[model samples]
Target: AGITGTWYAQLGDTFIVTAGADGALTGTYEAAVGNAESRYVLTGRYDSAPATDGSGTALGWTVAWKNNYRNAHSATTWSGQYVGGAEARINTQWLLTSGTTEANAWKSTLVGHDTFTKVKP
Candidate 1:
């Protein structure tokens, strides 16, 4: 259980969306100005909803992403799990990222988590 919410990228005047696990990251990025935008979904793991770290105070997650660009874009997204925190702290923002260009190319070595409020299963 770790960081899982959504990643948002703003390139110039465009926005993108990338969902965790699902690996469906898509958005509009301005190529002329070398810009990129995206958003990742930080939901609980499949085995457990509202996943939590050992401490059980904050939720943990293993965030990841995949590239589905017709051409090719340079970008990197990441997520980590924290023992105690909320979305305001856990949640992060990325813009015009540069890195690998493969399927789910980005992943956090440690736990990634978002500040989420558990509702139910």
Candidate 2:
């Protein structure tokens, strides 16, 4: 099976994926809002060719997320590698862009990470 389906994160985030054989992997990540956490909608693309090694396949994903309070757009990049052809562990760095908030101020780039496990049908 390919990387096409729904993935769940430990932080209560959900990812809906549509991975194409043409080396296009697109997805939408919906963040669960609770406990005063800001809800986010992240739309991303893995447009790079999948690299294969003895270990597994590695894919590069580029993502952008925005919210109303933010009133702007923010882009981030994530690199994910599949393990055993099933699990994908991703590490991401969030590069803050200008106009990311209602204040419309540019902020320093921040680093963050996440992991996604495929949800079986």
Candidate closest to the true structure, highest lDDT: 2
**Residues 1-121 of candidate 2: C-alpha lDDT, one tens digit per residue:** 3567777766787666676766667666565653213445443445345555455456656545555554345566666665544445443433444334545453535666666676522
TM-score of each: 0.23, 0.60
lDDT (tens digit, per residue) of candidate 1 on 46-97: 2223344443322222223332433333433333323334532233323334
Clashing residue pairs in candidate 2 are none
Which residue window of length 10 is worst by lDDT in model 2? 34-43
Model 1 score (lDDT): 0.32
Clashes of each: 28, 0
Each candidate's lDDT (Cα)? 0.32, 0.56
Best by TM-score: 2
TM-score of candidate 2 to 2 decimals:
0.60
